[PDB]
Amino acid sequence: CEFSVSPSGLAFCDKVVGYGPEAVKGQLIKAHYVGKLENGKVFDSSYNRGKPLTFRIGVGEVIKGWDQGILGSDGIPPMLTGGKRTLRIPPELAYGDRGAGCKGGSCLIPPASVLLFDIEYIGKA
């Protein structure tokens, strides 16, 4: 997957282009996903949770990289219903130098982590 890198650093590649309409700002949608660090370590996945993630897109309910990465931004077209997209998210658009899933200074997602997600946009909820 050759990434297309947008002005902000958020990069993507559409492994499978959706067959339906583009994602819409403020809509409740469903998405399956696998999030990994750059060393291949899986830090979270819908599959591990046993259910897709149901959330509204474009209103800050998830990291900025997901809002921009799914709804689109400068240099980033929107995902389409039924699409599969890989996203490379710089820390600035994820959890920053703070990290996530922390126990003291040790975090599941280390500070300044670039995150990789394989996103399956199922469609609206």
PDB file of C-alpha atoms in Angstrom, residues 95-100 102 107 109-112:
ATOM      1  CA  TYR A  95      -2.565  10.856  21.156  1.00  0.00           C
ATOM      2  CA  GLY A  96       0.433  13.187  20.962  1.00  0.00           C
ATOM      3  CA  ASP A  97       3.347  12.971  23.404  1.00  0.00           C
ATOM      4  CA  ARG A  98       0.864  11.946  26.056  1.00  0.00           C
ATOM      5  CA  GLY A  99       0.265   8.457  24.700  1.00  0.00           C
ATOM      6  CA  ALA A 100      -2.742   6.328  25.638  1.00  0.00           C
ATOM      7  CA  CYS A 102      -1.139   4.519  30.361  1.00  0.00           C
ATOM      8  CA  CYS A 107       1.580   3.386  27.876  1.00  0.00           C
ATOM      9  CA  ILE A 109       0.386   3.581  22.932  1.00  0.00           C
ATOM     10  CA  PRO A 110       3.786   5.199  23.600  1.00  0.00           C
ATOM     11  CA  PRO A 111       4.169   8.981  23.530  1.00  0.00           C
ATOM     12  CA  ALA A 112       4.611  10.423  20.008  1.00  0.00           C
TER      13      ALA A 112
END
